[PDB]
Amino acid sequence: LLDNLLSPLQVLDIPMISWVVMLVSRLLDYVNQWSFINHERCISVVQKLVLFLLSMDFTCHADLLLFVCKVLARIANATRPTIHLCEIVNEPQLERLLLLLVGTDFNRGDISWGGAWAQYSLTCMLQDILAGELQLSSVPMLNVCFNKLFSMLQVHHVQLESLLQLWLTLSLNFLYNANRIPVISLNQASITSFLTVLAWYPNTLLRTWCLVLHSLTLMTNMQLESTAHLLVSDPNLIHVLVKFLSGQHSPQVGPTATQAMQEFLTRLQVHLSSTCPQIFSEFLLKLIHILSTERGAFQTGQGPLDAQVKLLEFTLEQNFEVVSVSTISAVIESVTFLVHHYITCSDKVMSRSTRDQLMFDLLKLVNILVQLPLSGNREYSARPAYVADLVLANQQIMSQILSALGLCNSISVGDGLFTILTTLSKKASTVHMMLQPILTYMACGYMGRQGSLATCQLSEPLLWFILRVLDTSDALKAFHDMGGVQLICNNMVTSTRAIVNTARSMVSTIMKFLDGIHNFAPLGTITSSSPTAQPAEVLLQATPPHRRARSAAWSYIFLPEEAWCDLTIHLPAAVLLKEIHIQPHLASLATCPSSVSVEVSADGVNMLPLSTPVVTSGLTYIKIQLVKAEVASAVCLRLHRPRDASTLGLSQIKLLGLTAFGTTSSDQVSKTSIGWLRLLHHCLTHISDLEGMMASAAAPTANLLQTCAALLMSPYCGMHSPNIEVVLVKIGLQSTRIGLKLIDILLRNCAASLNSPLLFGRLNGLSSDSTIDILYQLGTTQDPGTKDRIQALLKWVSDSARVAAMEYGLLMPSPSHLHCVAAILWH
Amino acid sequence: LLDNLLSPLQVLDIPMISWVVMLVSRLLDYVNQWSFINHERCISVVQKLVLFLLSMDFTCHADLLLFVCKVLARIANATRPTIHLCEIVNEPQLERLLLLLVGTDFNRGDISWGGAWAQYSLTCMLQDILAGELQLSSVPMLNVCFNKLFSMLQVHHVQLESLLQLWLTLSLNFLYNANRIPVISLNQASITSFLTVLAWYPNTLLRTWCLVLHSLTLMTNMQLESTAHLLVSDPNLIHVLVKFLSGQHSPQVGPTATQAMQEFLTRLQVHLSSTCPQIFSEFLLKLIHILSTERGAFQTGQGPLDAQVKLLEFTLEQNFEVVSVSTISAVIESVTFLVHHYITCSDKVMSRSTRDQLMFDLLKLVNILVQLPLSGNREYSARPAYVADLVLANQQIMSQILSALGLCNSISVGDGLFTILTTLSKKASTVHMMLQPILTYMACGYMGRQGSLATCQLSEPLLWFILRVLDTSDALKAFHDMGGVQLICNNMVTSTRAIVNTARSMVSTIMKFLDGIHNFAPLGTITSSSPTAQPAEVLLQATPPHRRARSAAWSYIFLPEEAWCDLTIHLPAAVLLKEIHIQPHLASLATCPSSVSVEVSADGVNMLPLSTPVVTSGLTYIKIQLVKAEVASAVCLRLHRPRDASTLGLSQIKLLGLTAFGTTSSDQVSKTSIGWLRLLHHCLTHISDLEGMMASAAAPTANLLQTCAALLMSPYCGMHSPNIEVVLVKIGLQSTRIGLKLIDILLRNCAASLNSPLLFGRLNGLSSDSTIDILYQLGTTQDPGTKDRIQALLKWVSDSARVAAMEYGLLMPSPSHLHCVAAILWH
């Protein structure tokens, strides 16, 4: 009946056909993909049903199409030798059929031919018929058709997303699995056109990308040169993966997309492993280089951080043997520049309640790369020189790394840099290779500047690294041979001139005599630029409201056109602001500001934003820490209207910091000259057998003893007094002349002998346990100068006596130093 | 006393000096900027105090420095002829003093010389001394010094941020104001080096930018060629403003930075207005072009949207006379490409609870630009041709605009495009200039493709535009002369072949006989991949929990390493999912997911992410609307851990959509061929005097009447039946032959005479009010064909009679058509 009703296709009574198709559908379904709807004569009727599907125009209706598809599938699958797709259609028919699903003459993006239900029904019918099959195989014909469909992407005759979805659906035979061999084999031209289109494809949304990654994965599993090789060897693959990784939605792509990318890369690695894994590792390194280069995704903070971190994690497990040194060095250089920028461009505030992980993973990758042995000709990682040597010889890379570590303080990004530098030192061909960049760094100031008072930036981490490099006698001897001792001694003198001591002295003491951070908000006065706003004085109260206070202490009603509310807190006097706490109304977190822009005014008149607004939606407590404490007599909080409320509710605002003086006034290597002294102490003491040499290198430098004494008589600035004492004794004893100079510095004139050192800050002849010990050791140490030393000591005694019988050192001899001279004579 | 104590500067007893300085400070303060601390001999002591400040090294202490600064300022300001800075210091001294504040040998980024309090005290002292001044003026000397300091930026001897802060502070005399003339005049070399450094400066945080903008503003107010001209004429200014505008923090810069940018641009405009405003307008257009070009900020969705919108708003108020046509056309082209990308790359979901404003403002700018008169030589906007003409002649721009409007549906971005097109038509030199791009667009398919069934995308907005362009007789005549009637008629036939009707027909009726969107969540089964998660079935309940329910209906405890929780809802059958509602626990909005990644599965096995995760922190209700309804038998919600909680709390999840059939199964121009018919009706009816011509152009096209009849007998698809009837009568009457064909189509064979039209879908001879009216009018209209028409009518009667005495049209004559023939004979 249905056969005869359709016979005109090969006048139609569409109403009678409809009744019959519905009846036949109901009978066949009484005989899961079709729940949404709730053997030669068989070939005849199914062929006619396909013709009918192909004949449907605007006079036909999608709802009938659904049943036609359902019945077609069910009949194909009901016959003993299942009817194959190649018995049902021919090539032009199959092509038109698939174009109903994917052609741009039938589908206009959001508008699909026959609607979503028709698309779905057609797909389900094709899938059912194929599955029944999986005499003549239909796969050859599907291959022809899909290769044509892929050849049609470049001219915009086929929609990428629908083609991919369809090819995935039909080739999976139904759950996706990254190890599946597609039923429908695409040819090399298809894969190439696919990559080309993707490289230029402008509208790649996330669903499209997930389809793309799943399909690339399955393509790698096709027997086409393997497809994995074709793909990785194609320049377009890098463009495509860069587009993907370069990106109110979250920047992320979410776990499923990230895992899709991982599965793709894993499949590439696996297919290339037992043949040519070097091109895969080189592809990964080229990719990372592109992402890390200036104005690239990593540098601009673009793209799905989750996918980028996953890429780095995957890359860190790869074997980089037989990789070109050019790509390795390119990635090392881009990465070191990137991480240096990252550490130097750090935001001025921090709010918490990650890109660090990405930077750390890149530094880990660099660590892996610098350890690779080089080939004989130094062009490829091998498998006794190393990539490390090329890096050490690169002055710009080493400068960037060392200054980066110089900007770190006491595993993180700084730890990553330390690990790299430690590796570089272990892998350096010679200790000189490692020392030369260190010495270059120590010989210049900020960003390689020169100048009289310009000296390089030290940090506890960088210092620890240098000490590790200077750990062996061979390293210390080389350091000496390259003029390192003179360099650190000069740097100590210079840096001591170019810093003022921030440790409190007697001015702070006189202030205290005249009467962990502290909340100054309660002392403040709070205003709003809005004339209608509720008085916010309650926000300043030292004691917050109860964590269940049902009504926000303070509320702001936004006019429908208002994006920002402002609250300015004027303090009675400037303070060193370190943190700003904002407590939103916990009971109604929808009224929390979506973001907060902090401006600070030192003079309390000219406000300056601290940073870009911090995102605060979803936070129960907003803690904005100033990385660098700022002098502030006023703080303007600009609170952005909540995402999902017209009122802003706040409980408390705290402005935490320190006063200059009073009770509320509560990395030395980075802020003082002490790091140079710690280096000098290490050189003088670490390898006793070299002390002599080091002392002789150090003793000549002008004003070194005066500076070291100054550091000795300073409040603790990151070096325990005994080490400074040891430095002073070893230099003072390395020769008689310097011994006399040290005695004169301690007892008589301790000042330096606009860029010249001065050391005016200390009274002459002051004594401490340290100077007593030093003088005792100078007196009682037995060597050629001992006599002269005693002599000078006795001179200072009689001189003092003489002045007393009538130089602040001589008008005010320390009783302790006199007693020390007596204790020396006694011994 | 203090003078004599300091006399060694020009041995120091720093303790005695400290006591004295503190006493003197207390006496002077008993005789607001210094609250943070709580006349030739005068020149002598102040000079010595400056020497002391300059002599401070690590043996001196910052706390004393504070009082030294306070006392220095107070003494300078206490003497009758205030002591001027130039009496206190000389050039090298002043330079060192300022370098204490801004030099990189004394300041290391976060580490400042003497600490924040010392920096502040030094600044306050300089400001106080200057203010007292404002015999010899100190301004010349400050000019020298600051020009030197700016010359020192390029070699990294001066920190940009501190130099800018200091120059701003000192030149303002204290509240900042964009109309202030700086006290300290910088020279051309300074401004040039400033711009150069800024162009390359890698670490420009927001405070740096605010300083930069304030200082550029004030520089424009300096009498240096005016400084405004120097700035705008400098290529670096564009690089700098692009860096600024190209950018958990909000992408925005906040109101203060945005206003700083506006003030800067306003000052540039004002300074350049009465001299050379064309270079300023050209600068604005070059800037916008750079931001809008491919891979630029606007295109990549980067930078402070608030500042970018403010830039566009500012630009929209400028006069663009005497601007080069090259820059105008460049910006028009980049902007049209951008907005086309924007409309075509729209996200697949939408969540609400803006970049549109930016796109709309760019389209407004384009609208302003296309209206500019051209100079005689067509190289510069003038002040009777227009930029509009150049745009109309640009095929790529017109294609992009028209396809963009083709993707819009019934002021927004689409309104902006419509406004532009309307302007282009009003400004076109001739109607042909406007019609040619329309006709080109109508002659091709998607992205200019060709093909048998490929036809262009129409939309209600684009259609309205075309009708407005075809409003006059001159326009309709030209449209006819260029073959537009034949084009729209062919397009109607073709598009009708290439679409299936999605309107419900009798299959939906039979389904209903066999028994605004709907929540299918309650029918679903919900699971989590986490074995420990609480059963989430409560989330599916049709009825939400009370809006004050104190305990989340469902909660998920995140393991410390878990970023995502997942909830998969399997539905009993596929549905057309249109929306996903997620109700978080309103009482505890801290437990709301920070973001939600929706995956949908049509087969309920293979999940595909819909889009990148939607940001949901701060939302009281999460409504994710699928722009394109998707078939879904399962939905996987991946909820991201809250920003500030280890538990996720949810009240309800709804999955709203439609079933294919049943009770729950509840822009035609874009999805049908009707737009072509609305155009044909407009051509045939709008200017009665042209009807003849139009009809003669339309009547020849093959299968046109069959298609128009098909559309007539279709369910309403965006065209009321009377208009279709008018089209049919006018064509059928334009000649006797076609009249006979129309009679045969209505009474006998209505089917078309894989790309050929078919129109199989309709029984022959069916009647409606419309066909009755058409046939009546054909019969009773008096003209040459009338007789033949009656004749054919009578033929159909007797033929029918004859078949009855023994073509479905003849075996089933409509009683209504027979009666209509009788009513015709009677008249």
A545 DSSP 8-state letter: P
Residue A510 CA to residue A518 CA, distance in Å, equals 22
Crossing angle for the helix pair B721-733 and B736-747, nearest 10 degrees? 130
A765 neighbors A811 (Cβ within 8 angstroms): no
Residue A24 burial (CB count, 10 A)? 18
Q: Residue B117: its chain A contacts at CB < 8 A? A: 576, 631, 660
Pick from B113, B176, B254: CB nearest A597 = B254
Residue B8 CB contacts under 8 Å (≥ 6 apart), including other chains: none
Determine the Cα–Cα distance for residues B567 and B653; give it in Å rounded to an integer.
10
Q: Residues with Cβ < 8 Å from B514, sequence gap 6 or more?
A: none
How close A62 gets to chain B, by Cα (Å)?
5
8 Å CB contact between B86 and B137: yes
Angle at A295 between CA A292 and CA A299, to 5 degrees: 45
| Cβ atoms < 10 Å from Cβ of A381 | 24
**Solved using:** cryo-EM
**What does the DSSP assignment read for B175-187?**
---TTPPPSS---
* Same structural domain, A596 and A611: yes
Structure tokens that stand for A767 in this block: 């004594």
A57 in a domain, yes or no? yes
Q: Residue B775 carries which side chain, given as an amino acid letter?
A: L
| Among candidate residues A526, A586, A581, A528, the one with its CA nearest the CA of residue A557 | A528
Residue B290 lies in a domain: no
A795 Cβ contact list (under 8 Å, min separation 6): none
Q: Which of A117, A497, A761 sits opposite B631 (nearest CB)?
A: A117
The DSSP string of B215-279 is: HHHHHHTS----HHHHHHTSHHHHHHHHHHHT--B-SS-HHHHHHHHHHHHHHHHHHHHTT-HHH
- Please list the helix, strand and coil fractions of chain A in percent, rounded to the nearest 5, in that order: 55, 10, 35
Whether residue A269 lies inside any domain: the answer is: no
Does residue A250 form part of some domain? Answer: no
Quick one: A627 and A680 in the same domain?
Answer: no
Residue B737: how many other CB atoms lie within 10 Å: 12
State the total domains in chain A: 3
Residues A662 and A762 in one domain: no
Rounded to a whole number, what is the distance in Å from the CA of A762 to chain B's nearest CA? 6
DSSP state, A558? Answer: P
What residues in B contact A30, CB-CB < 8 Å? none
Residue/partner pairs of A268-274 with CB below 8 Å, 24 or more apart: A268/A220, A268/A228, A268/A231, A268/A232, A269/A318, A271/A220, A271/A221, A271/A226, A271/A227, A271/A228, A271/A229, A272/A226, A272/A228, A272/A229, A272/A232
Q: Looking at the structure, do residues A532 and A659 belong to the same domain, yes or no?
A: yes
Residues A620 and A736 in one domain: no
Beta carbons within 8 Å of B36's beta carbon, 6+ residues apart: A573, A574, A575, A631, A633, A659, A660, B117, B120
Integer Cα distance of B360 and B809 in angstroms: 55
Helix (H, G, I), strand (E, B) or coil at B813: coil
Does residue B442 fall inside a structural domain?
no
Does residue B692 sit within a domain? yes
Interface with A, mutate which of B11, B53, B105 (most A CBs under 10 A): B105
Of the candidates B729, B700, B756, B755, the residue with the CA atom closest to the CA atom of residue B485: B700
| Tokens representing residue B527 in the block | 């699971």
- The DSSP element (H or E) to which B71 belongs, if any, is helix B62-78
Beta strands in A746-811 (DSSP E): none
A628/A733 same-domain check:
no
Among A99, A115, A136, give the residue marking a domain's end.
A136
> Is B57's CB within 8 Å of A498's CB?
yes
b/e burial code for range B260-286 (CB count within 10 A of at least 16 → b)? bbbbbbbbbbbbbeeebbbbbbbbbbb
Q: Which of residues 260-299 of B touch A (CB under 8 A)?
A: none
Kindly provide the b/e burial profile for residues B166-189, where b requires at least 16 CB atoms within 10 angstroms of the residue's own CB: bbbbbbbeeebebebebbbbbbee
Residues B133 and B126: their CA atoms lie apart, in Å, by 11
Residue range(s) defining the domain that contains residue B538: 518-665
**Separation between Cα atoms, residue A784 and residue A733, nearest integer Å:** 10
| DSSP assignment letter at A761 | S
**Buried residues in B127-165 as b, exposed as e (16+ CB within 10 A):** bbbbbbbeeeebbebbbebbbbbbbbbeebbbbbbbbbb
CATH of residue A612's domain is 2.60.120.260
- CA distances in angstroms from A788 to A741, A746, A772, A785, B441, listed in the order given: 11, 16, 18, 5, 104
DSSP string, A304-316: -HHHHHHHHHHHT
Look up residue B789 and give its two tokens.
């028409």
User: Are B633 and B703 members of one domain?
Assistant: no
Tokens of B36: 């943070």
List CB contacts (< 8 A) between B167 and chain A: none
Cα separations (Å) of B648 from B552, B584, B596, B643?
Answer: 9, 9, 12, 10
**Alpha-carbon distance B719 to B723, whole Å?**
7
Buried b (16+ CB within 10 A) or exposed e, A812-821: ebbeebbebb
The DSSP code for B114 is T
Spatial distance between the Cα atoms of B25 and A507, rounded to a whole number of angstroms: 12
Of the candidates B500, B161, B662, B809, the residue with the CA atom closest to the CA atom of residue A69: B500
For residue A328, the one-letter residue type is I
- Do A684 and A821 sit in the same domain of this protein? yes
- Is A258 within a domain? no
Cα distances (Å, whole numbers) of residue A827 to A747, A773, B496: 20, 14, 118
DSSP, residue by residue, B686-733: SSGGGHHHHHHHHTTSTTHHHHHHHHHTSS-SSS-HHHHHHHHHHHHH
- CA triple A809-A813-A819, angle to 5 deg: 140
> Is the CB of residue A548 less than 8 Å away from at least one CB of chain B?
no
- Taking an 8 Å cut-off on Cβ atoms, the answer to whether A761 and B57 are in contact is yes
Give me the residue label for tokens 């990682």: A381
Query: Vertex A458, ends A456 and A459: CA angle to 5°?
Result: 160
Q: Is B580 helix (H, G, I), strand (E, B) or coil?
A: strand
B16 and B133 belong to one structural domain: yes
Is A182 among the domain residues? Answer: no
Comparing alpha-carbon positions, the chain A residue that sits nearest to B338 is: A202
CB B697 within 8 A of CB B730: no
Residue at A99: amino acid letter: L
Dist CA A318 CA A365 (whole Å): 10
Q: Check: CB of residue A232 under 8 Å from CB of residue A272.
A: yes
Substitution target from A153, A500, A647, A648 for chain B, most B beta carbons within 10 A: A500
Yes or no: say if A727 and A777 are a contact pair by the CB < 8 Å rule. Answer: no
Interface test with B, best of A171, A502, A677, A711 (most B CBs within 10 A): A502
Report the alpha-carbon distance of residue B539 to residue B753 in Å, rounded.
Answer: 58
Q: Same structural domain for residues A736 and A653?
A: no
Out of B255, B341, B576, closest to residue A116 by CB: B576
Quote the tokens at residue A162: 């629908």
Q: Is B716 on the interface with A (CB under 8 A)?
A: no
Gap between the Cα atoms of A306 and A313, Å rounded = 10
A624 φ, ψ (degrees, to nearest 5): -105, 105
Residue that is last in its domain, among B174, B201, B225: B174
Q: What are phi and psi of A653, to 5 degrees?
A: -125, 125
B517 touching A (Cβ < 8 Å)? no
Q: Which two tokens stand for residue B470?
A: 């075809």
Helices (H), A178-253: 188-200, 206-220, 227-232, 235-245
CB B413 within 8 A of CB B367: no
* Cβ count near A544 (within 10 Å): 16
Q: What residues in B contact A631, CB-CB < 8 Å?
A: 36, 116-117, 119-120
3-state helix/strand/coil string of A426-441: HHCCCHHHHHHHHHHH
Pair A697, A820 in one domain: yes
> For residue B441, what are its two tokens?
């667009």
Chain A contacts of B508, Cβ < 8 Å?
Answer: 63
DSSP B126-151: HHHHHHHH----SHHHHHHHHHHHHH
| Contact yes or no for A620 and B300 at CB 8 A | no
Tell me the structure's resolution in angstroms, rounded to a single decimal: 2.0
Instruction: Report the first-to-last Cα separation within chain A, whole angstroms.
Output: 130
CA of B506 vs chain A CAs: smallest distance (Å):
7
* Residue B373: Cβ-neighbour burial (10 angstroms; 0-12, 13-18, 19+): middle
Residue A322 DSSP symbol: T
Contacts of A148 (CB under 8 A, 6+ apart): A95
- State the DSSP H helix or E strand holding residue A98, giving kind and residue range, or none if neither: helix A91-102
Contact B207 A671 (CB under 8 A): no
Last residue of a domain, one of B665, B700, B715: B665
DSSP letter, residue A770? H
Contact A731, A699 (CB under 8 A): yes
Could you tell me if A303 and A251 are in contact, meaning their C-beta atoms sit under 8 angstroms apart? yes
Q: Which residues of A touch B761 (CB under 8 A)?
A: 12, 14, 56-61
Q: Classify B608 as helix, strand or coil.
A: strand
Report the gap between the CA of A310 and the closest CA in chain B (Å).
14
Asked if residue A648 and residue A704 are part of one domain, the reply reads no
Contact status, residue B610 vs residue B348, Cβ threshold 8 Å: yes
Largest CA distance in chain B: 141
**What SS3 class is residue B287?**
helix
Q: How many residues does chain B have?
A: 827
Q: What is the DSSP string of B11-62?
A: ---HHHHHHHHHHHHHHHHT--GGGGT--HHHHHHHHHHHHHHHH--TTSBH
Given a contact cutoff of 8 angstroms between Cβ atoms, the answer to whether A337 and A294 are in contact is yes
Burial A177-206 (b: 16+ CB within 10 A, else e): ebebebbbbbbeebbbbbbbbbbebeebbb
Query: What tokens appear for A601 in the block?
Result: 């005014």
Please name the residue ranges forming H helices in A585-720.
668-671, 674-685, 691-698, 704-712
Angle between helical axes of B206-220 and B254-273 (0-180°, round to 10): 20
Tell me, yes or no, if B671 comes closer than 8 A to chain A by beta carbon: yes
